[model samples]
Target: RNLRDLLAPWVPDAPSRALREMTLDSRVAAAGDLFVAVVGHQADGRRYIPQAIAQGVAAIIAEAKDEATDGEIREMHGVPVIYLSQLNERLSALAGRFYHEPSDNLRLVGVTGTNGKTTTTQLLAQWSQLLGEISAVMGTVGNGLLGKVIPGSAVDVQHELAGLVDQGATFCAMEVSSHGLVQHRVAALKFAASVFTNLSGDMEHYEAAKWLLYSEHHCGQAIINADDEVGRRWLAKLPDAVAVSMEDHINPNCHGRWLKATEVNYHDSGATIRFSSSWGDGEIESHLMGAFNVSNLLLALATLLALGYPLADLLKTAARLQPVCGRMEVFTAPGKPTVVVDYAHTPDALEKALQAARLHCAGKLWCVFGCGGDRDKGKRPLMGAIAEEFADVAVVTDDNPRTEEPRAIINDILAGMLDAGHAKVMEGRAEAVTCAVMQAKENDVVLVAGKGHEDYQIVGNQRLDYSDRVTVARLLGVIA
Candidate 1:
């Protein structure tokens, strides 16, 4: 690519120069590469321009920010340095331009919210691929072609999407974090569809940041979960947005595009969802467990439907959609308790996970959870209360006791419960999980909450190798 074309949108009259790659760090800047320098909260990128130039970068784009006049061009060591104000905000666009705007070449979907971002994005990719389009996923798990995610900054996002396109991916499903939206990570990409799962928060600020995706970005199609209060409010504001619900929250009088579950059967195997949508009516036999999975699936369905994918095709592939790793992922074996490994760290999430597990449990439900140390201390007691209230057996265990005493965290959880004496206290996570799985009856269900999909435990400053799924699976004689 040429520097002139890369900067054409912002720097017109820029001299043409061959460029190889784009980088944000001066340390990684190399010859023939375009290095972008921006003032960040911690470090100023302008300070590293000399380093980047010394590394033989073809050109440099530094944040003006009153340090230099916006669009001011200077020459150093035969390298042109162009300064632009608000460079952080415009970096996405610049990277998009340099990467030839790869998002335009694929059906890109962005899923956002406090939770369900990973699952919803995975569902979108899986469902789209079932319809014959090559798909990819980018988010919490990682970023790569479908079944191959490896993980981004905004520049990295654009570059990765371009790489996915190069790998023949016709579709990409991405998780758009609130921080990403606030920092303008995905601000420049043209989304084929934008999905709102649910928002929980300075909650006004959080809601505003999430609202930016639909309000500021080019969300080709808006898919809102009508079950969420915030989502309902957003749905009311965006008449054209497709409203999806498993709880029958869609207002029939509105006559807007909507998808709602007419009936849902939660069986041990999975959920059988019967839904009616503007596109058409169909039944989905999902292998994924729980009510939230139904919600996530419906959101994915409504999103693709809004994007013009035939409803029948989506229904045909519904059962094939797999549960995301650790997000309500269930593991079971003969004569063993049904164990669910989920990344439910917060109080609300713990309660929801237990409730979801209860639907499949014929006997007592066991909840094994712990809080991360050095993080928020407020939710600990709340989670304990939720476990006590929601589960028949509460097994308090260590999560990530980073730099904090494990017993202290457990005590915090115990504080929330009315009967801490009834709760089994175990410090080692593996022991707690094993004990729950061993003691519970075959008909019972055990929810090993928190640290889902995470393979390491943070003890002090070290990350010890650990996985809740693997531990539970091993206890149940199932492969990890």
Candidate 2:
């Protein structure tokens, strides 16, 4: 592609030169590459223009700082240097043009919330693939076509989606993080649908979540969780939006197409969901556990149905919809207590996981969880409170101690409880999980939280190998 054509969308009368690649970092800028120099928080990329030129870059597109810099064409050793004032906000659109607008070639759906982004994205990708087209996912777990996931990033988001289009992915389900949306990472790509799971925190974050779906991006068919207050408000602004509910969030005043779970049966394995959407009414025996997941599942259901997938086909293949690896993942064997591994890091998530586990527990509900060091200390006691209130036994332990003292973190957690002595203090995560699984009765349900599908524990700078499911299986003598 010509540099002039690529830059024409953002820069008028751009230099006419063959461009091989585009980049933001000077270290990776090579021959035939158009290097973009923008002002950032920590360091300025404009200072690296000489270095990029030295590396044989084709041209330099810099942030306009003054009259001399704004759209100015200065030659650095015969390399063209063009400038734009709002380069930061214009990065995504420019990259989209450079990448041939790859999002236009494939269908994309974005899932955004405090929780359930990973699971909902996985569900969207998997469910879409089962219907026919090749599906892909981009989120916390990783990014790739349906079965294969590889980690990493790009100078811009559009380039990655463009690459996915090249991979023949007909559809992609992306997790749009709050930070990512605020930064305008996915500013340019048009989504066929935007799904809301639920929101936490104050009105600022709630408004921001609403921003991603309708304000920031023209996300087609706003699929919302009517159960969420923000979702309901956002839906009011978008009357044509698809509203999905489970907890009677949909009242008579609600407008537009909506879907709700009439009844759900949570069992040892998974849940049997009977939902009614605007498209039709049907029951799907989903292999996913918990009420939160039913919310996630129903949101995905409403999203797909709103996008035009036949209800009959969705119901036919809904049972094969496997549970996400870490979210409410249940493992059990004959004559053994059911063990569930979940990525319930927040107070709300922990409460939800415990309540979910409680559904399958005929006896006691055991919660083995811990808070990560160096993140949110305020949530420590809050989580401690949730576990203490929700579980029969709350076993507190270390979760990614990093640089902080593990015992100190545990102490902060214990401080949140009404009766600190009621909670058991266990510093080692593996040992705590083992103790919970081994000591629980066969009818009891044991929940290992905080580090769901994660296989490593961060101790200072070192990441030690650790897994809740592995430890549970080892304790059950199912694995060595």
Candidate 3:
């Protein structure tokens, strides 16, 4: 693609120079490269124009308030400088054009919400792959082809999508965050479908910006979790949207296209979910636990159906869908209590985690959890209450108590428990896991929540070696 073709969509006006590459970092600027300078919360990229020029950048694109042409071009270095009316909000679109609109080349499905985004995305990718289509995922865990994920960033998102397209990925499932949407990170990429899980916190920082994100990408099909309040509002706005629910959150009779759970059965191994949708009806015997997972599965199913995948084909592969590792992962053996590992660190999340475990437990439900040290402390007591209320037993242990006293964090959590007598405190996480595993009876269900897939424990400034899966397996005398 030529420079004119790349910039034509965003900047139609004739350019004085050509661009060989598009870059936001001044350090990587090279000859014939266009440098995009954006104003961020902490630092402004416009301050690096001199550095970009010093690195032999061909053209400069800076965000400015007015059409003022009173800017220096660094005559000594010889680079063309142009000011965009609102560069910060339009950078994604600009980068999209430069990347040849990669999202358009592949079927893109975006899942956004306070929870279940990662699990739903994984389900979508895995289900699609099972049907013999090449699929990829981009989210919190990482970004890449299934099983080959690498950590991601705003810039890397576009790069990863483009690479997946180049590698013949027919579809891509991406997890969109509130921060990502507010920052205009995915603005210009055209999506085949977009799924809204739920929203958290009022849009205080970017009030109207959230709505603009959905409005800007009007062409994509919308798959919304009608159970969410904000999602219901979005359904009202997008009449053609597909509303999915596992609870009685939306009226299915009135909606244009909808999917909802008719029945669900929880067991020690997993869950059996029966759902009905506008396209068709089907039941999935999934190995994933929790009612939240049923919500995630329905979203994934609705998204694929909306994108024109045959309902029968999806149903045929539904049973093949596997549980995501380290996220509500289940393990069981003869004469041993069922063990679950999860990354439920928030108050609401901890409540759901225990509730899910309680459903499949034959005897008592045990919760082993703790809060991260440097995060929002206000949720400590809230988490404590959740564990005490939902689980039969609670074990307050360490979870990355960085720089804070582990005992102090434990004390904060203990404040909300109505019956601290049922709670046991163990500072060493490994010992805590051992105590739970060795003491719980055969019929009990034990949840080792927080730091699911993580292999290290962060104590103060040091990250000590630890693995919850390994510890649990060791206690059971099974090789991990």
Candidate 4:
């Protein structure tokens, strides 16, 4: 690409030069690459301009904050270095320019909030694909065309979306994290619609970050989850936002568009939900288990509805939609208790997972969980209390005890329980899962929490092979 053409919008008097690629790090800067140098909170990228220039970079876009005025340019070693103010804020647009605005070429739907982002995005992608669009997903699980997701940032995000576009993806469902939003990762992407899945436990700052999707960005259609108080507040302000709920939170009087589940039956396999929406009325037989999952499904449905997908088409493929891998993932055998694996490391997530498991469970509900070491020690006991109250059996075991004593973490969890002696404490995660699955009655449900889809364990800086799903499946005499 020509440098003058690329910088035409921001830099009119720019000299012409051919560019190969754009990079932020100076180490990777090459002979024909354009190196973006910004002053981050940690290090100053401007200081590394020498290294990048030494690498023969075609040009450099440096942050002008306290260094140079906006739109100022200078030449070094016969290479042009253009400086601009607020470069971090402009990075997204610059990236979008290089990537040829991939988001515009495809129907990009961004799903935000704390808990259900992954599941909701997965459902959106799956439903759209089933409706005959070449769909893809981007978030926690990875980024790629659905099912072929390769496990792997914002510049990274733009690059990935461009690659997906190159592969002929007509639609994409993306999980927008709070961290990404605050950092302006998806700032330049044009979203066809944005979905809000409930905000769990974050008070004000988190809510504000999530709000930026509608407040600051170009979110075409806003699909708000009326179930969350925060979501309700947002819906009140955005009258046109489609309010969706499975918990009777939708207000027909105020909102012009809404979707609510009239009834839900959580069976062993999944849930049968009957819902009425602004678009139309339909029933969804979801393979995804739990009440929260039903909520997630409704959010996905509401988003597509706002995007103009026919309600009948969504309902027809609702049964075919599958749950996200390792997220409330179910495993069972003919003669054994049902087991569910989830990545619920937080107190609220654990409580919700257990409650969801409770509806499908006929007998005692069992919880097997642990806390990661060297992180937030506050949630350890909180998870312990949740397990004690929600499940009949609570087993505390090691979950990535990185550089911290496993027994100490177990003690931290046990401290929250009313009667610590009643809870089973084990050193090995696999043994704990096996104990719960083996001892529980055939009709009982065992929930293996914390590390859902992950297949490794972190022990004192060493990562060992481990998977809760595999352990539970093996204990239940089924393939993982």
Best by TM-score: 4
TM-score versus the correct structure, for each prediction = 0.84, 0.83, 0.84, 0.85
Question: In candidate 1, how many clashes are counted?
Answer: 1
Alpha-carbon deviation at 7 in model 4, angstroms: 1.9
The pairs that clash in candidate 2 are: 402-460
- Compose the digit string of candidate 1's lDDT tens values, residues 1-480: 998888777787888899999999888898999999888878898888889888999998889987788888888889999999989888889999988899999999989889889888888898999999999999887889888887457899899899999999999999988778888898899998889999774978866755664576888888999999989989888889999988779998988999999999876557888989888898989888788888999999999999998887787778888898787888878777888888988988888888898888889999999999998899999999999999999999999999999999999999999999999999899999888999999888888999888999999899999999888877878797
Candidate 1 has which clashing residue pairs, if any? Answer: 143-151
Steric clash count of candidate 4: 0
How accurate locally, in lDDT, is each candidate? 0.88, 0.85, 0.81, 0.88
Winner on TM-score (3 vs 4):
4
Worst 10 residues of 3 by lDDT: 67-76
Model 4 per-residue lDDT tens digits across residues 1-480: 777887889999998999998888889898999999987768998899989999999999999988789989898888899999988878888888888899999999999888888889889999999999999999887899988998814577888899999999999999988788888888889999988887655667765655654577888899988889888888888989999998888887784899999999876667889999888888888878798888899989999999999988888888888888788888878888888898999999899899999998989999999999999899988999999999999989999999998999999999999988999988889889889988999889989999998999899989999999888877777788
Whole-model lDDT, candidate 4?
Answer: 0.88
Clashing pairs in 4: none
lDDT digits (tens) for residues 25-79 of candidate 3: 8888887788878777787888898888888877777776543342323332566
lDDT, residue 154, model 3: 47
Q: Give me the displacement of residue 243 in model 2, in angstroms.
A: 0.5
